[PDB]
Amino acid sequence: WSWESYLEEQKAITAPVSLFQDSQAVTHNKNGFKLGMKLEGIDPQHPSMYFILTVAEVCGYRLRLHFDGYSECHDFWVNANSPDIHPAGWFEKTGHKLQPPKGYKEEEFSWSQYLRSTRAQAAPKHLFVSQSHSPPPLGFQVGMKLEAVDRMNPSLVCVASVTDVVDSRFLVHFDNWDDTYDYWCDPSSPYIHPVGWCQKQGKPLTPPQDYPDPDNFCWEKYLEETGASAVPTWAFKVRPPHSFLVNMKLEAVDRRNPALIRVASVEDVEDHRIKIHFDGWSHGYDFWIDADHPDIHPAGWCSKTGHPLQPPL
Amino acid sequence: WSWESYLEEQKAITAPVSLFQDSQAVTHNKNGFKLGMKLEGIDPQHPSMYFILTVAEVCGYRLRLHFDGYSECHDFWVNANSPDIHPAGWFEKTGHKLQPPKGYKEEEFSWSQYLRSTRAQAAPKHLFVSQSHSPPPLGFQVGMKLEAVDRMNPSLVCVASVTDVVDSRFLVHFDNWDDTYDYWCDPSSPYIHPVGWCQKQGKPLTPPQDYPDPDNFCWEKYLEETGASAVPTWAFKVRPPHSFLVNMKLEAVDRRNPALIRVASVEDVEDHRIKIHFDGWSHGYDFWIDADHPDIHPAGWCSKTGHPLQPPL
Amino acid sequence: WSWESYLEEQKAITAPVSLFQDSQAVTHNKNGFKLGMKLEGIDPQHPSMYFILTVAEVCGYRLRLHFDGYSECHDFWVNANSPDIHPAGWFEKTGHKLQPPKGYKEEEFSWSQYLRSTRAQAAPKHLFVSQSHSPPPLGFQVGMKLEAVDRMNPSLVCVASVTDVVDSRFLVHFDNWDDTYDYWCDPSSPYIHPVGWCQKQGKPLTPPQDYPDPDNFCWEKYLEETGASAVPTWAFKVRPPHSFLVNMKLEAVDRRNPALIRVASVEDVEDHRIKIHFDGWSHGYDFWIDADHPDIHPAGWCSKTGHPLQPPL
Amino acid sequence: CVASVTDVVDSRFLVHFDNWDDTYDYWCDPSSPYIHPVGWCQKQGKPLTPPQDYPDPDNFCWEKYLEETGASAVPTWAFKVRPPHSFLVNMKLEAVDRRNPALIRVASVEDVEDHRIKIHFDGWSHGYDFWIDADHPDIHPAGWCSKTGHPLQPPL
Amino acid sequence: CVASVTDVVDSRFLVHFDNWDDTYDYWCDPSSPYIHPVGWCQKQGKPLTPPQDYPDPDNFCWEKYLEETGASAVPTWAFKVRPPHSFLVNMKLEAVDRRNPALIRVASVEDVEDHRIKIHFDGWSHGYDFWIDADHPDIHPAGWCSKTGHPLQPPL
């Protein structure tokens, strides 16, 4: 419809561009991904693992990725500036493991030969914002230890490790646990803390799954025993709370059908999260989201990138 | 940029592949090292000593290694075909001593238990070019004696011993001195000489540190007294001088920041060393290097292995 | 503290002297300015306006200037090779207006009288790189119009005029706006464009402040009404982008405390600007600066000129 | 749960849960139906939740805790619970909207307990219904908005 | 390279490189590891060397060349896998001297590939070492010289 006339009739304002990360706001980059191009990327359900992916669909600045050899029911959407996708050949050049297409074996797979056999085009390197050609996030080296909130069970702060580093980001892993609980972040993340923070704050720390003698959990000796260092405290930066206010309007991907983006409103706020309401829909579909999530955008993003915008219902 | 267009504009040639050791030139081997893998290797500053190391970073055919338990400030870069790294378990199986992770005790350390406690993966054996599964360098047995140039003080030729043998290489140690002056080489090394060479050449020989009666230094009796044999003269092979010429171009690691490799030129030559100039930089950063050094490579090495190449400044 | 030890410690490289303009690098010129000397110069905050200034302090190749008759809170620092200062008499010989000392009238000020009143010495002419004696910038005449980026609001490209010409540079003024927005440039400045550039690039052009019909600004009519000519298109030159790279280290004056010069790093780059980070300080103090700005310098500049250098936090 | 008095102001005091932060704390008076003397759970047959990280939580015992902490129990006699309120289902009133506290709306008693009422906002979904203490400061008799100069939101 | 069968004698055939000197020709059998069917380079992503003086060197195409030349490809079924040899480094044997072929010398396996071995003459410089196919007629087991009546040269 038009944002302009909507704002007049509702007597409302949009969340200003300045409130968003540059990466959530940028509209002027073209999407150079094309149908059938091949690449590598993380599995959103197993964020430590990398698979061969194909571009199955492009919509504006977004793309839908298919896991080669597997079912289309696993396909998922990302933005073209996603740091979670990488060019063909990246895994080998940066020390990562590639899970091959269904029916291959890790060491059976070669990009040269795969491309010959498929006659497919690898997505060109220059498309990717993350190629491990930037120097890491200061002070966060693989194997180092920290305390982290289990984003799945937010009342728990837990023994955790850095297991992956890529450009300005690193992977937080829970000791003795599935990669299912892992998550990517950067040194300003509000979900991470230096070794000792729990003790110094009052809260209990959850030790590694099936550790010997859990209440008697000692960090400086866990550390000596694992040949690990804790991430230095000077490394952990303070992300300031976001400045979104209740009733500001924006555009947000609909988690019920991620192909769609909708007119939305800020229904509530915490320091680092906002509660999203889709205008014209039930408050039952209202949901909490991290302010820095890739799937929230300023008003006009859809229009400038060429993605349909769902008007209010 | 491109080598091709650079060579045309400069009216220059690259040092041909044939000029390099196969090990400096090989691009077609993949790097199978992955972040967090554990292994063993020498300390580049104390080349007689072995430590537990972790893969901290991978770039193309290179990797950055971290000393477990110690500071990240000691991390160092090697190539994936380095003979100075070995699989977990190597020390025990080949008669070498392992200095354990900071806070352990030599005999407190067990790989089984370390891996259980860290939940880490040992780098697979098949990755390593040096596992002591080759028969030694002919005629160079541990305890044997020779004359060697102190690569740190090149005007000195000195009483020296073989103290380590691994595959085709052996460790040259200076009698009564720190391991700080030690270096690895092979029987074609131009820095080593049979017992008597000094006397037969005219030059003075430096005896062991704090030996009784230095000018009166007698080899055949030093020998009888130490229950040692000299390395037999037939063992010392003649490495021919290299064939690099001034102005040939190549790629070379920048010692100021070893993460980087640069376009370079041959500025000068000796029989077994070349002087490297980084195109577009001051001649003040020009440096001498052994022709067989692992950190010089033919043009196109970076491109074929997936390591960034710094173009001329 | 030394640069040599710090670079080894950090595995870092300094920006070479070759990347700087000669004027930013030159260390072998002596500072002839002495305490109490009087001269003329622009107010850095209002670069179209000239004042009587006195040397209040000298530090290496830098000097602090004081606005005669005004508060010391307005003192500012320049290099001894600044083109923004001029000898006594220059204003009257070159058609520039003097803002006289606090409490004088323009017609009231005479250098002869003032020097007699104060018993002070004028800075000698031979100190000054700029006396309006060198050939003017080709094609840029006073009164000619052009399109310019508002460096204070860089999203705006605006109707502007040449209002001053001194040696090889000219002053860009934004029609009917505060002179605080004015800036000095040369023909290669990346911030200026010929009349018609916005329309050819499809960018909005910002019209003069209080333009009688803001809606329908037309350059052809404006030029006619104002008795003005466009700067001809041939006069505009391409400045090549700078060659500074992220992580190179250098020396930069502290914007908050300009008496101080600090160890600095290149945090980010654009074609014509660099982003400065002060090593050891918060990235909150980081700032963008033009590559040609007179207050960045190569490592070594402070020690070679005799200016103290502040080590990293 | 095991609790302490940590603040006293006029006739009210602050109930704090030992070893927990203050996010679960609440202010009340001697007649609160939510407070009981030390020993109440044992006398009534209800399980007692020990402090958040108490060492041997299965063997938590009050007479030992009181001696490790040098504290005494609020005297049993001080607890004088209030009678149940007399709000009946269907009675109407005004109540602050929890989701937008600037607004007061027409309301109904949907359901009752001894000390609480279940508020329903007239014309709205029953999914919006909530339980609230009968002494809560944000419920009011009909006419309160009109008499105090606050707008009332009509049903729907 | 593009090549042709130009001779057949008993169980072997001669491989010839189209329009090159016949000095490059060699005899083989179907299991030779040096030959591949038409299309192998393109399937393996290797450059194929075209005939010498091929009229348009740039755009060599097998389909057109076969047609222009009235020729058929050797069918793919005819090519057999030869298993790699089982010689190991340091095994000793007898080998004819390439420089003085009248002579057979004590020799050692210096290095191995799947189908070749590198010969070292014991007591001589490694500068005289050479690669040779495992099936070459001029290497023999220890004892061959004495059992056939050929003199054997001992190590330097």
Brief overview:
This is part of a larger assembly, with five copies of chain A. With 313 residues, chain A is an alpha+beta fold.
Structure, explained:
Chain A is an alpha+beta fold. Chain A has 3 domains: 101 residues, Roll (SH3 type barrels); 104 residues, SH3 type barrels, CATH 2.30.30; 108 residues, SH3 type barrels. Chain A is 13% helix and 27% strand. Chain A has 7 helices and 16 strands. In chain A, the strands form 3 sheets. In chain A, strands 1, 2, 3, 4, 5 and 6 form a 6-stranded mixed beta sheet that branches. Chain A has a 5-stranded antiparallel beta sheet with strand order 10-9-8-7-11, with no helix packed on it. In chain A, a hairpin with a 7-residue loop joins strand 12 and strand 13. The PDB classes it as transcription. The entry lists the keywords Propeller, three malignant brain tumor, transcription.
Give the topology, please.
This is part of a larger assembly, with 5 copies of chain A.
Chain A: H1 3-10, H2 22-25, E1 38-43, E2 46-59, E3 62-67, E4 76-79, E5 85-86, H3 90-94, E6 98-99, H4 111-118, E7 145-149, E8 157-166, E9 169-174, E10 183-185, E11 192-193, H5 197-201, H6 219-225, E12 249-253, E13 261-269, E14 273-278, E15 287-290, E16 296-297, H7 301-305
